[PDB]
Amino acid sequence: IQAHYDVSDDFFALFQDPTRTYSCAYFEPPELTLEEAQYAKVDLNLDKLDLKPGMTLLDIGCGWGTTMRRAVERFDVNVIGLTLSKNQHARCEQVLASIDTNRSRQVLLQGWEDFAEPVDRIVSIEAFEHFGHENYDDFFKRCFNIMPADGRMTVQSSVSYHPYEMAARGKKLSFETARFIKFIVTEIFPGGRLPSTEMMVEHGEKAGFTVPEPLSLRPHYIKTLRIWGDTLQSNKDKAIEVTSEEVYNRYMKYLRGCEHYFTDEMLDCSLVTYLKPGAAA
Numbered sequence: 001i002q003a004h005y006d007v008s009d010d011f012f013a014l015f016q017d018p019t020r021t022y023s024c025a026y027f028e029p030p031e032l033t034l035e036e037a038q039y040a041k042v043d044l045n046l047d048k049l050d051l052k053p054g055m056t057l058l059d060i061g062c063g064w065g066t067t068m069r070r071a072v073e074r075f076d077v078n079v080i081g082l083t084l085s086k087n088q089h090a091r092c093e094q095v096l097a098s099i100d101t102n103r104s105r106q107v108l109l110q111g112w113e114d115f116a117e118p119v120d121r122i123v124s125i126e127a128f129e130h131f132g133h134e135n136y137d138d139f140f141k142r143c144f145n146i147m148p149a150d151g152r153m154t155v156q157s158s159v160s161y162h163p164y165e166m167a168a169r170g171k172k173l174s175f176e177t178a179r180f181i182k183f184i185v186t187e188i189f190p191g192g193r194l195p196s197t198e199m200m201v202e203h204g205e206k207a208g209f210t211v212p213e214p215l216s217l218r219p220h221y222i223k224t225l226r227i228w229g230d231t232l233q234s235n236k237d238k239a240i241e242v243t244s245e246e247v248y249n250r251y252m253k254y255l256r257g258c259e260h261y262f263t264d265e266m267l268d269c270s271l272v273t274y275l276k277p278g279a280a281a
């Protein structure tokens with residue numbers, strides 16, 4: 001039933017930039033194109049990790065391979081990617097195999113639940129919303145355990161607020177946001193659950209990480225979603241012929257709706273850094 005909501009790489013290409021990044025971009029400086037801003041976001045995350053030549057970076061939820069390839073090119077690291085999409089696995093294999101490097105590059109069709117190999121640093125961009133609340137302690141424990149004494153990880157994720165925090169903004173908007181979030185986690189990312197920033201932080205701490213102040217990316221997601229939404233709309237006829245009127249309308253509701261709730265400050269997007277006790281200063 002969650003399989004009813006699988007969509008082809010054809011469709012995503014009709015709103016995403018040529019890197020095929022499916023996550024909040026970083027418009028610093030403000031005038032960057034979406035493509036440039038996606039590279040800036042990858043850099044934003046990678047720069048937090050204290051990566052040195054010859055380390056192994058794990059990317060959990062590696063999408064179509066851009067983050068891994070950028071890490072190899074910039075940092076001369078080995079890379080391992082995990083994805084649960086067979087399509088993304090295939091594209092990543094092609095992206096990774098054709099990098100001019102001596103470093104090791106591997107993409108695995110499996111979840112973090114199944115991965116327990118030593119790595120030096122971890123990046124996870126907008127996969128965390130798929131994991132589910134019940135699995136947070138296990139996720140952070142696993143990340144802590146596979147890393148060395150100086151390990152670091154970044155996790156970028158959309159977030160909501162506790163229903164109490166929301167009801168402070170008025171009951172009407174609070175219930176309407178809760179419904180829209182249920183839509184995201186049913187029709188866009190089936191089986192998902194949006195965390196709060198507080199859950200992301202506290203679960204990391206319980207596992208033993210040091211957690212600095214999270215970075216809010218909300219204004220940047222506003223811009224990202226506007227550009228996505230404008231692109232899909234411009235590509236409407238193509239999108240419908242690639243899929244259906246149903247999928248097109250589904251993604252326009254998601255894109256326009258997310259832009260609206262981020263604007264209204266009912267959603268946020270946090271980039272959280274997790275530092276192990278022996279992490280560099």
Ligand SMILES: C[S@@+](CC[C@H](N)C(=O)[O-])C[C@H]1O[C@@H](n2cnc3c(N)ncnc32)[C@H](O)[C@@H]1O
Nearest residue numbers: 021022023061062063084085111112125127130
């Ligand atoms: C919204 S995409 C983000 C992809 C990429 N990080 C980016 O910024 O474009 C979500 C990714 O998370 C992956 N994913 C979901 N649950 C996962 C899990 N339990 N373990 C590993 N990957 C997972 C999906 O297969 C997909 O690659």
